[PDB]
Amino acid sequence: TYPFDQNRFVQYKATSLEKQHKHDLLTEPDLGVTIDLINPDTYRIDPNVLLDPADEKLLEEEIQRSQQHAKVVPWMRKTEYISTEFN
Amino acid sequence: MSRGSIEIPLRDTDEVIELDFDQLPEGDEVISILKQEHTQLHIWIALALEYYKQGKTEEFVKLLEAARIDGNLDYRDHEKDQMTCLDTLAAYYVQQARKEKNKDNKKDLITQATLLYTMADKIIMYDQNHLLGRACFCLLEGDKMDQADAQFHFVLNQSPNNIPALLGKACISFNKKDYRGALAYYKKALRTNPGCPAEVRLGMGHCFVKLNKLEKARLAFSRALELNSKCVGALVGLAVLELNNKEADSIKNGVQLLSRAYTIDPSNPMVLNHLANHFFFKKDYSKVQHLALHAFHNTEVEAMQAESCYQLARSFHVQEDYDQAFQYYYQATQFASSSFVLPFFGLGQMYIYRGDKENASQCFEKVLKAYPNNYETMKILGSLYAASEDQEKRDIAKGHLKKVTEQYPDDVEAWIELAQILEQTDIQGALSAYGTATRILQEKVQADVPPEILNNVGALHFRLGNLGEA
Structure with a gap:
């Protein structure tokens, strides 16, 4: 098995979702x-205005x-x- | 325009006490005058409304508590005055309960509000004013929302041109995500009475975003900005729109507007979140945590905590505080909107760190289902599923890794990850993948091949039969 780093994806880095959100x-x-x-003033109804x-x-x-x-x-x-009238 | 003079009939005297609004003395003197005068309840209501309009709720509060006990109901229209006076104080308690941000204060005020609202029901319930007041009181709690819906509905049935009832129906329509009816009721409610606080019109602007009418929302925000500059919601919406523009100058001016709004009202949670996301990039992570913590505690709704917690968790990811970042990422995901997926990404990373590969895959699967084209999540998902015991997942890992390799010609780790699963059944494919990885290592990296890749290539050749190459 290849020895991949155990925290290669844990470390924070710029991602596509960062700018696409x-x-x-x-x-x-x-x-x-x-x-x-x-306030009854707001309860009043004025259709004329x-x-x-x-x-x-x-x-x-x-x-x-x-x-x-x-x-x-x-x-074309x-x-x-x-x-x-024509010539 | 003259404000008007209140007239009070003096007991056993033809002369009437006249007092203009401008120079009305303190309410403490007026309460005693009325008590010694034994006047009708409608005078009490007029004075109550005057002090409410003056901006001093304490004066209005005091005279209404004292009035409801020693009123003089010896006239034809006593019942209507009594209902209005009791319901006014009850509905003011509901409104003041909504205003305060402390749940304990809400319950304390809500206790007396419930008592007084039941008392108003005792005398007369069919009154339209009482009906709308009960609807607002029951809407406040949120567990009686359907009662507000029904109450506003038949109150609206009583009168079509009725802004308060229509406003309540539109608000309830917004709560239940009935977008068309909400929009229709808002339009008609605004038609009923042009004179109204600008807050109602704010509901229009956001509704336009709810319908994706971005230019319409911008125009609505501009009109809101022109009419009233003290509307925090309008400024928040405009700032959010500028943020959604995704332009460096847009972000910079949106942050300045967010700072102005936060200065206007720092208690609002949402405004702080947008400006703290910028603070993250400013490297002042301490202020980022402060603002994120401030926003998370200030709010009471679950949807808000989707953002703040995330940012804090995000802020905590670069502080290497993986346990607390884990917990707060989980909180952001637990209270999350379908529009937000970054907390799941961060939560997957935390689960990955902690060794919870399966649940990390679940979070990444949720993100992929929400957004299936992201390259970063694709690479991580391909790697994570490559090392899976189950056979069925190995094909999906192969697909993800194949997708990643095609999108990215230069990814040694993706090529190796793909090769490590092609070995199981595709000797030629694994050989091709290992060869490709070796080509990038020699070309760009300019480093000698790792012994493990050479051993695995040789083993594949042995399986094929090329003993010399092996």
Whole structure:
């Protein structure tokens, strides 16, 4: 048996997973927001007031071109059409 | 805009006491005035809400405890005032219990909160305000979350344009990982009332990341940053996004923003984790341990401890404290997210060091199942399974080692490891692998072959029949 080092993989060294990892957003289930029942002011509902522009953008429902015709291609040509006057 | 003047009917006198909000005296005098006046409960609620708005909860707390006993309910609308006054204090206890970071304090406040919430149920339960308050109280614990779901659901049924009930349903939708309903309820809840603390809008930004709308999340964070600079969650999300950008300048500016947020609120666990990961590279491992330990103790949720512990364990791996690194790597893996696998890598290394080859392979197998293309884990897994008594694993070790050798033309140890298992059934393959290893040793390493490789090559030749080469 070849005498491999007994702690060749124990020693810390740069790894691919070190730079390829991804960080995640972890927060409390309610996410720093609670129902402010204490204040009736927040309980008031005002439909007359205009909606914020960002809020309108969010309301848009989500549903789940070739530039070849315009390529120059020098050799090709165009096509004229019947005109009442011609030489 | 005038704040307004509170009017109180004086006992047996037509004159009414008028007090403007701006110059309202201390609540200690107001409580005695009301007690000697025997006024209606709605005046107490108005004064209670005024001192709550002033930012002093102690004044509001004191007048509400004193009011609930000596109230005057000799009028038509006494029941509604009584319900609101009791429920306000009960729900404030729940909110204050949530605010504190000590579990013991939570239970002490929760005790009186439960007593007072049961009392409110005694008189009237169908009241919408009482229903939402009970939903919040039951949501706080977390074991009564389904009751909050049902309560917010039928409260929402009562009124569609109702931000608090819809907000609770959206929060519960987030908790149960119902992403579409959560997003829909949040959008509609924000529509109901544009006037609301910016915290609700923070829930939008993160939801966009939950839907992978990174540019949308960036825009949401920018709008959050513009409107309110005191939102720690928004800064944390922006810093996390910059971290996820994976760019040196992005990391540097994200760390500065993380420091600013930690200065704003050092008690938040998540913010500290991102900046401590940078500290690891700064070589100030003592500060790394401090920040990692600080974040791990501060939080109360299990998902958070996935990161901090890892970093600490990682920090402990370069301090050669393999036993404590082992234990803390195990803690990080025990409370881990599917998105995080590095703790399993570190835990496999610790198990490898301790001699727990089988469980180390299990951790590495988990990492491989999560991420099957990593080269480092592939090499380690190939080596570890090569020295396996079971025959079936030798083929997998061969495959891993073959995969490693193809990806890496120059890996003497991988070639030797592959050869040591090709010997069992593939004499020519083992000979080819040993020859390749010898070629790299002579070419790059520029060292004479080890005697063991020469002996094994000769033994393979003997098995083949090349006695002269043997």
